[PDB]
Design a protein around this ligand. Structure first.
Ligand SMILES: [Mg+2]
Length: 223
């Protein structure tokens, strides 16, 4: 095993309920009624543009989408900062154990810089991460499920993608890892362990990072 690539949202922090609240609040502001629980189950995982188009019930331009997406992300960042959402159980321990083993690791996220700034600020990520090797959406690559984000992360760490572990919490993110050639381990923050195992090419899923060891991860790659 040459590296570990961590997804952030839904993987290192369990922030999906907060995203749901922010989209429900945005729906209420824009259309006058929040998204129902059934609406959000249908929509969870779609792009910000698709969410706003659902709320307006109309296809819009990329530039329209960016403006309302930024309103939603401003609400999310503000709530996240004052929330007590912590890094997932066992994550910090894994971070320290990895450095002690001289195994490089970094974060890849679909989040734009606005959100990443909050992540670094709130979670003191410079304690464990070189901030310049955190991969985020800077609009220079295709998002998940495309492989681009994880090839970008492996190249930043100077390692071969096929000897990388990726921790991911969504269907599109698991398929980004698989398409890149990395070995994914699912984080059961929204899907169950068994639901993540039903994906072809996902052969281990866990609830928290307390449930994984360096040795389990090395063996998964060798297999
Ligand atoms: Mg995620």
């Amino acid at each position: 095993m040459e590296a570990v690539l961590f997804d952030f949202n839904g993987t290192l922090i369990f922030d999906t309920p907060l995203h749901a609240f922010c989209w429900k609040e945005m729906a209420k502001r824009i259309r006058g009624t929040p998204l129902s629980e059934d609406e959000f189950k249908l929509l969870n995982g779609r792009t910000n543009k698709q969410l706003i188009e659902h709320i307006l019930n109309k296809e819009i331009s990329d530039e329209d989408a960016k403006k309302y997406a930024e309103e939603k992300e401003n609400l999310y960042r503000t709530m996240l900062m004052k929330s007590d959402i912590k890094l997932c159980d066992g994550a910090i321990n894994l971070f320290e154990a990895l450095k002690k083993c001289n195994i490089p690791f970094t974060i890849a996220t679909s989040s734009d810089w606005g959100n990443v700034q909050v992540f670094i600020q709130k979670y003191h990520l410079e304690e464990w991460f070189d901030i310049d090797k955190i991969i985020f959406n800077d609009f220079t690559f295709k998002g998940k499920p495309a492989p681009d984000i994880y090839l970008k992360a492996s190249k930043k760490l100077g390692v071969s993608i096929s000897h990388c572990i990726v921790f991911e919490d969504t269907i599109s993110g698991i398929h980004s890892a698989l398409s890149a050639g990395a070995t994914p381990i699912g984080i059961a923050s929204e899907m169950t362990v068994n639901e993540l195992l039903q994906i072809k090419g996902c052969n281990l899923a866990i609830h928290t990072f307390n449930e994984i060891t360096i040795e389990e991860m090395v063996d998964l790659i060798k297999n």
